[PDB]
Design a protein around this motif. Structure first.
Motif: not given
Lengths: 275, 10, 99
Positions: A241-246
């Protein structure tokens, strides 16, 4: 760690375009391992993970027969729901079901689940006691009465405490090289100016399994929950899986921001900064 | 069965 | 009673020109389940596109992963075009490879 087995049914009517479609998928944690689709050329319960493939013909016959039976039941359920909600026969409607069991490190039952929906809204759920029901409206109350009379909760409980946990333990062993392996996230921070006085810091997590993760941005050590843009965890297509936070930060204040990462595959939570 | 065979009508 | 799809377009691995990869379009949070998804290469529908089996989240909303094997260049641009009953016109999301 702890693990879950979940099956998901979707039954979808389509008046004028034949009988309702019934699709079932089975998961152990975030790994799909079986599918059944009534629209398939030759509908059968079918493997979707290499570790289930070693199950013999009696398994696949058993599961297939059960799915065909269930598909018939849920097609009737769709008709029954029409009458419960005074609905016309020209509309398309959907029944969804999720059920299964969670176990701990020791393989003992943590909790069972059996929940259903109609047109995307809660319909009826088996309570955690696996003995009583929660009906979402007066339609589902009719089903509840029927299920109470037929001691359906007792049947589900037997399955959830018994076969469900037994099969889950077996799958966990057969797939121990993958189901019992956590892959930690590969992490980094990117930086992009928006204007002369603001920049975006984006905290990335790639290649992790299972899907559960926490990415948080801190400014001077305080969570920026309200100020963080958090994208939905997404599948890469290789099991991971993948995720980002900005976050949008003032130019020159970048080092006051830290990204914090929690994942089962990490022995300790990570702290990263832009470099 | 691994799936449940408990399917009771709505 | 209806929920409009969320859309993410992204690659399986970080992209490097000339190196083979997979192009993904993940659609989620939608209800009902009928949905039309195309992956686009320079505006043209890609023929080879597989997709995951229909499943759903705890809030009953559906999700699907559409994907295709592909080799990024600086020349070619990619996108995901999605239609759903909730959408008047198809929604097109461009793949941003500086992420």
């Amino acid at each position: 760690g702890s693990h879950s087995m979940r099956y998901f049914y979707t039954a979808m009517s389509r008046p004028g375009r034949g009988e309702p479609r019934f699709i079932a998928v089975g998961y152990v944690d975030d790994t799909q391992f079986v599918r059944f689709d009534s629209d398939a050329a030759s509908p059968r319960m079918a493997p979707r993970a290499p570790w289930i493939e070693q199950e013999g013909p009696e398994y696949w016959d058993g599961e297939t027969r059960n799915m065909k039976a269930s598909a018939q039941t849920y097609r009737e359920n769709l008709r029954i729901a029409l009458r419960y909600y005074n609905q016309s026969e020209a509309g398309s409607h959907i029944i969804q079901v999720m059920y299964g069991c969670d176990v701990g490190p020791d393989g003992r039952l943590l909790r069972g689940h059996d929940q259903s929906a109609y047109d995307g809204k809660d319909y009826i759920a088996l309570n955690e006691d696996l003995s009583s029901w929660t009906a979402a409206d007066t339609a589902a109350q009719i089903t509840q009465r029927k299920w109470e009379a037929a001691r359906v909760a007792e049947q589900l409980r037997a399955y959830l405490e018994g076969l469900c946990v037994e099969w889950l333990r077996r799958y966990l062993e057969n797939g121990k090289e993958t189901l019992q392996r956590a892959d930690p996230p590969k992490t980094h921070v990117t930086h992009h100016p928006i204007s002369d006085h603001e920049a975006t810091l984006r905290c990335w997590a790639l290649g992790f399994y299972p899907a559960e993760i926490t990415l948080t941005w801190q400014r001077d050590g305080e969570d920026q929950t309200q100020d963080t843009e958090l994208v939905e965890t997404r599948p890469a297509g290789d099991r991971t899986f993948q995720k980002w936070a900005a976050v949008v930060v003032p130019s020159g204040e970048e080092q006051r921001y830290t990204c914090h990462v929690q994942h089962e595959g990490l022995p300790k939570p990570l702290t990263l900064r832009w470099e | 069965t691994s799936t449940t065979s408990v399917a009771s009508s709505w | 009673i209806q929920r409009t799809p969320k859309i993410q377009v992204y690659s399986r691995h970080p992209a490097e020109n000339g190196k083979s990869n997979f192009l993904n379009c993940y659609v989620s949070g939608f209800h009902p389940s009928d949905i039309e998804v195309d992956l686009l290469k320079n505006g043209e529908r890609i023929e080879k596109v597989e997709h995951s089996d229909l499943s759903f989240s705890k809030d009953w909303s559906f999700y699907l992963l559409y994907y295709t094997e592909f080799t990024p260049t600086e020349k070619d641009e990619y996108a995901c075009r999605v239609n759903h009953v909730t959408l008047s016109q198809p929604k097109i999301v461009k793949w941003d490879r500086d992420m």
